[PDB]
Design a protein around this nucleic acid. Structure first.
Ligand SMILES: Nc1nc2c(ncn2[C@@H]2O[C@H](COP(=O)(O)O)[C@@H](O)[C@H]2O)c(=O)[nH]1
Ligand SMILES: [Mg+2]
Ligand SMILES: [Mg+2]
Ligand SMILES: [Mg+2]
Ligand SMILES: [Mg+2]
Ligand SMILES: [Mg+2]
Ligand SMILES: [Mg+2]
Ligand SMILES: [Mg+2]
Ligand SMILES: [Mg+2]
Ligand SMILES: [Mg+2]
Ligand SMILES: [Mg+2]
Ligand SMILES: [Mg+2]
Ligand SMILES: [Mg+2]
Ligand SMILES: [Mg+2]
Ligand SMILES: [Mg+2]
Ligand SMILES: [Mg+2]
Ligand SMILES: [Mg+2]
Ligand SMILES: [Mg+2]
Ligand SMILES: [Mg+2]
Ligand SMILES: [Mg+2]
Ligand SMILES: [Mg+2]
Ligand SMILES: [Mg+2]
Ligand SMILES: [Mg+2]
Ligand SMILES: [Mg+2]
Ligand SMILES: [Mg+2]
Ligand SMILES: [Mg+2]
Ligand SMILES: [Mg+2]
Ligand SMILES: [Mg+2]
Ligand SMILES: [Mg+2]
Ligand SMILES: [Mg+2]
Ligand SMILES: [Mg+2]
Ligand SMILES: [Mg+2]
Ligand SMILES: [Mg+2]
Ligand SMILES: [Mg+2]
Ligand SMILES: [Mg+2]
Ligand SMILES: [Mg+2]
Ligand SMILES: [Mg+2]
Ligand SMILES: [Mg+2]
Ligand SMILES: [Mg+2]
Ligand SMILES: [Mg+2]
Ligand SMILES: [Mg+2]
Ligand SMILES: [Mg+2]
Ligand SMILES: [Mg+2]
Ligand SMILES: [Mg+2]
Ligand SMILES: [Mg+2]
Ligand SMILES: [Mg+2]
Ligand SMILES: [Mg+2]
Ligand SMILES: [Mg+2]
Ligand SMILES: [Mg+2]
Ligand SMILES: [Mg+2]
Ligand SMILES: [Mg+2]
Ligand SMILES: [Mg+2]
Ligand SMILES: [Mg+2]
Ligand SMILES: [Mg+2]
Ligand SMILES: [Mg+2]
Ligand SMILES: [Mg+2]
Ligand SMILES: [Mg+2]
Ligand SMILES: [Mg+2]
Ligand SMILES: [Mg+2]
Ligand SMILES: [Mg+2]
Ligand SMILES: [Mg+2]
Ligand SMILES: [Mg+2]
Ligand SMILES: [Mg+2]
Ligand SMILES: [Mg+2]
Ligand SMILES: [Mg+2]
Ligand SMILES: [Mg+2]
Ligand SMILES: [Mg+2]
Ligand SMILES: [Mg+2]
Ligand SMILES: [Mg+2]
Ligand SMILES: [Mg+2]
Lengths: 51, 110, 97, 118, 38
RNA sequence: GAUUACCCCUUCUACCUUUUGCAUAAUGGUUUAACCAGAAAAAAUCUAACAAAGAGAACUUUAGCUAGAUACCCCGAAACCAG
RNA sequence: GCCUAACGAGCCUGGUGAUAGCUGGUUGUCCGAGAAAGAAUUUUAGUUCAACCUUAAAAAUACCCCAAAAACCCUAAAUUCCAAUGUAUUUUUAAGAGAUAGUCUAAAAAGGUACAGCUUUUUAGAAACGGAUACAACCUUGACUAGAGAGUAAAAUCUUAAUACUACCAUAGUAGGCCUAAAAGCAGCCAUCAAUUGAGAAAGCGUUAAAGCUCAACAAAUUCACCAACAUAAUCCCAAAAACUAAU
RNA sequence: UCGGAGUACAAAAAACCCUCCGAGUGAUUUUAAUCUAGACAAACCAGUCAAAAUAACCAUAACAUCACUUAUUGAUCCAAAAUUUUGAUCAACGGAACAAGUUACCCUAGGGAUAACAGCGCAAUCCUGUUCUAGAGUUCCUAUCGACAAUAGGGUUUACGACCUCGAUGUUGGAUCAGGACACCCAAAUGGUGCAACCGCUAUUAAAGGUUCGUUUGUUCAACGAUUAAAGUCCUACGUGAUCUGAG
């Protein structure tokens, strides 16, 4: 090995914790999506005509 | 047939908490058919010979010298027949207590 | 076949990998303007870069690790002396002699 | 019972000729591994399957780079029959930020920083 | 299924056979036969 | 798959069912047409109303109530009973 | 037995859409994940719980895991438990069913015949459109679509078939002492000395006891010489063939 | 049904019409309280420990003990008791409040998940060879035999296993016609003999062709009469019932 057993202790514990914070955060964000007027109203475009 | 009734389920005798674990008072540390592990510091002995924690803390197993109670005939006999240098050793379970016993707080300033 | 030779010579075992055969932009406009880049080469760029970035990262982490250890050794050795400087002068046994 | 397996440390004490043979330096251990998954995890026990998954070795014949620290060497030791391990080499040194786009990894296991100038 | 020990010599799993065949003893072969030397 | 070329060449052990496992020499079918078999809203989830209250009476409520939408097959015994 | 072509109890209608843990059947397309059994049970042809699993939802740690640690006579492969580290998983909450008639391979055992494509548990694995001619389970292989590109994997005739050992020469105490009808080198018991350059109170055959053939002994010479070999089935043998032009 | 040891070698768990011991309670007085943190165990039901705090008692006094101590046990409902309880070889021991035979007169639903025929696996039993010689053979192991054992094959018998078939793979012996093996009964060619000759007894090679007629048995075998150059051993779904027979 390059490092000994004790030389690698916690040698990256900062990155590991960070990663897990991102994993958590990604899941915490899950919520039903926003609903907008452009949808419910935009449906009416179905019957659009020439006159 | 000749052979009968050998059928009974295991008793799940084992060691429940292991060295270095955290424990809360009243946790069963081990359960055993005969004494295998003896209770040490802050570990209570049940009447079925199971060991439970009397204190919140950390479990530790240890080898230590065995000096039986003089009210026990058998054990004192076993001890009495040993060659003059020999000492019985056994395995013990302790709980090294964690929280401090209590704190002093400021109630009222008169 | 002939992957063994190709490896001894330091190329890719498969002619498809990373040679000038694959990497280069196989067509161009007659005028000489370059062609829009190729999807394959784009992806290969991105993941080669990803790889490189990672190499950098691990190298740096291992270095910073070793330095942290050396520092901790120094702090320990400094505390061993921080005990002696801060110590009281031994009196009792020496004064009679 | 077929079980997991101990691997006596004597296996991993290198003989002085081995340095000459595989091209490692007697004095200084290399910094990084390029690990490749050479075999398949099928027909192997679940624990090797897991080790391969957590080494990023999922896809075959794709290189992956790992620290040469003992934490990693342990897992690698478990699956060493499923993989090929070769030391990463840096002739041109580690890449700066200008060199990230031009980086490439040659099969002799060496990372070239400037790829295809003009 | 057969017991571990048996009378009949017990055909091996193929991979074990390959092991056996690779690990056979190889006697050292002198460069010149000692008889044809002086 | 092809091929200038129908074959000739090459590659593929019908389909359902049942099974640890079916090319199976296990089940079923000559073929065509027409008929021939998943049904319910207690709790839940989703959408919406109004909200300490909601329901067009009767009830339910320590965010609930009201409404809507989401769900559970077909053929077959030997028998038994009455006239 | 017979009671209108089927009587261990007629026929018809109604009860009736009797009831079947048992068999059969169950109709558009495409996509996402995805299951082999612990417990009870008139139960083992079935259910209902667990464990897995699916759909949503909340979280936080989840595997992997170095010391340290877990028994008293002997005792293996190894477990348990846990930081670091590599990863992204795991746990709860709310809804759900299916499944619970199992195969072979390797390993530890038991039963049997140290028999089974046998049976019963435990650990692991598999169920290719590639390979092992054919092939479920062995081996290679993280299963997308289109190419009249490329690199690799496992993989295709297995070795042996071996046993030659020959010349030359033989006379002396003496039928050594015993037991026995006879024991003369050679039913048996005991000594095992001694002439000749050289030949045992004799290693095999032989005789009723001999006589008689050979061995070891001289001399004569001298390639090498320890062991090793093992019949067969019922429709018709079963690719064809081939000891060298360079092959990690 | 319950427990202890092995199986199950070191955390737990772990099967068998597996190997072995036990339990369905005694004896005794120390008559062994109330309430509650936390746990063990676990599908559920049941089981287990247990600090602190109360109350009992020396006036800061809570583990009934022994017999391997582990097991000495039983849910609901319902009955008896009146204050607080007791009640099942419900032993098929998760327990139906109370029910036996027989069917070849049988029926239906299924099952090759499971037997009888046949196949297949295997080779205990069976059959072949070789290996080894103590011994039989007056002497002499191997002319002819050969104990104790050894190695390997064959796949007839009886089993063993339950893998194909139960929406049918119709079963004993005959008849007819036979296909095949060789482990040869006859015919041919030889080696050895305890082969003089005639007979024989063994062994080698050879499978083109042959291998009878009757009395009794359903019979295959078997016994008997008469013969033959001989009246072979077997395999073919114990060949052959969409060719026959039907005694069994
Ligand atoms: N022994 C006993 N019998 C019960 C119990 N519950 C119901 N029974 C039933 O009540 C009935 C009492 O009538 P018995 O036959 O005893 O005169 C029996 O059929 C018995 O089985 C119970 O708890 N114990
Ligand atoms: Mg037991
Ligand atoms: Mg059990
Ligand atoms: Mg692509
Ligand atoms: Mg086995
Ligand atoms: Mg079957
Ligand atoms: Mg199934
Ligand atoms: Mg098949
Ligand atoms: Mg078939
Ligand atoms: Mg057919
Ligand atoms: Mg079949
Ligand atoms: Mg059929
Ligand atoms: Mg069919
Ligand atoms: Mg059927
Ligand atoms: Mg069908
Ligand atoms: Mg049909
Ligand atoms: Mg509702
Ligand atoms: Mg549905
Ligand atoms: Mg009735
Ligand atoms: Mg009825
Ligand atoms: Mg009638
Ligand atoms: Mg029905
Ligand atoms: Mg049933
Ligand atoms: Mg069926
Ligand atoms: Mg599966
Ligand atoms: Mg019952
Ligand atoms: Mg369930
Ligand atoms: Mg450890
Ligand atoms: Mg951990
Ligand atoms: Mg079942
Ligand atoms: Mg089996
Ligand atoms: Mg398994
Ligand atoms: Mg094939
Ligand atoms: Mg794959
Ligand atoms: Mg895969
Ligand atoms: Mg001589
Ligand atoms: Mg023969
Ligand atoms: Mg041929
Ligand atoms: Mg638990
Ligand atoms: Mg107390
Ligand atoms: Mg019962
Ligand atoms: Mg029961
Ligand atoms: Mg129970
Ligand atoms: Mg009932
Ligand atoms: Mg009768
Ligand atoms: Mg009658
Ligand atoms: Mg029927
Ligand atoms: Mg069967
Ligand atoms: Mg079955
Ligand atoms: Mg039949
Ligand atoms: Mg039979
Ligand atoms: Mg038959
Ligand atoms: Mg049979
Ligand atoms: Mg058949
Ligand atoms: Mg055999
Ligand atoms: Mg004799
Ligand atoms: Mg046969
Ligand atoms: Mg058998
Ligand atoms: Mg079976
Ligand atoms: Mg049948
Ligand atoms: Mg049929
Ligand atoms: Mg014939
Ligand atoms: Mg012959
Ligand atoms: Mg003849
Ligand atoms: Mg013939
Ligand atoms: Mg037969
Ligand atoms: Mg027949
Ligand atoms: Mg017949
Ligand atoms: Mg007929
Ligand atoms: Mg026929």
């Amino acid at each position: 090995p390059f490092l000994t057993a004790e030389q690698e202790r916690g040698h990256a514990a900062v990155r590991r914790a960070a990663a897990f914070q991102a994993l958590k955060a990604a899941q915490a964000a899950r919520f039903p999506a926003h609903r907008r007027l452009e949808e419910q109203l935009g449906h009416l475009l179905v019957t659009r005509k020439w006159s | 047939s000749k052979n009968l009734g050998g059928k009974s389920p295991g008793k799940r005798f084992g060691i429940k908490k292991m060295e270095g674990h955290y424990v809360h008072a009243g946790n069963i540390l081990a359960t055993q058919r005969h004494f295998r592990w003896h209770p040490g510091a802050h570990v209570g002995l049940g009447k079925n010979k199971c060991l439970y924690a009397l204190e919140e803390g950390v479990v530790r197993y240890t080898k230590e010298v065995y000096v039986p109670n003089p009210s026990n005939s058998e054990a004192v006999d076993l001890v009495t027949r040993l060659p003059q240098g020999a000492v019985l050793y056994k395995t013990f379970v302790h709980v090294v207590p964690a929280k401090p016993e209590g704190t002093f707080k400021l109630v009222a300033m008169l | 076949a002939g992957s063994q030779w190709r490896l001894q010579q330091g190329f890719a075992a498969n002619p498809s990998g990373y040679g000038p055969l694959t990497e280069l932009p196989d067509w161009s406009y007659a005028d000489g303007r370059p062609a829009p880049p190729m999807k394959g080469q784009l992806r290969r760029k991105a993941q080669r870069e990803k790889f490189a970035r990672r190499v950098v990262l691990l190298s740096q982490e291992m270095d910073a690790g070793l330095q942290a250890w050396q520092l901790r050794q120094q702090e320990k050795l400094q505390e061993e002396e921080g005990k002696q400087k801060n110590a009281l002068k031994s009196k009792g046994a020496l004064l009679q002699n | 019972k077929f079980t997991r397996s101990r691997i006596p440390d004597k296996v991993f004490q290198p003989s002085p000729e081995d340095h000459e043979k595989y091209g490692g330096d007697p004095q200084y251990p290399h910094k990084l591994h390029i690990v490749t998954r050479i075999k398949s995890t099928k027909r192997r026990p679940y624990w090797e399957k897991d080790i391969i998954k957590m080494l990023g070795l999922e896809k075959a014949h794709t290189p992956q780079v790992h620290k040469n620290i003992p934490s990693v060497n342990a897992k690698l030791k478990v699956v060493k029959h499923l993989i090929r391990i070769k030391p990463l080499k840096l002739p041109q040194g580690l890449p700066t930020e200008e060199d990230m786009a031009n980086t490439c990894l040659k099969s002799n296991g060496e990372l070239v920083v400037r790829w295809l100038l003009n | 299924g057969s017991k571990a020990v048996t009378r009949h010599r017990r055909v091996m799993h193929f991979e074990r056979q390959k092991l056996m065949a690779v690990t056979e003893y190889i006697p050292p072969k002198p460069t010149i036969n000692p008889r044809c030397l002086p």
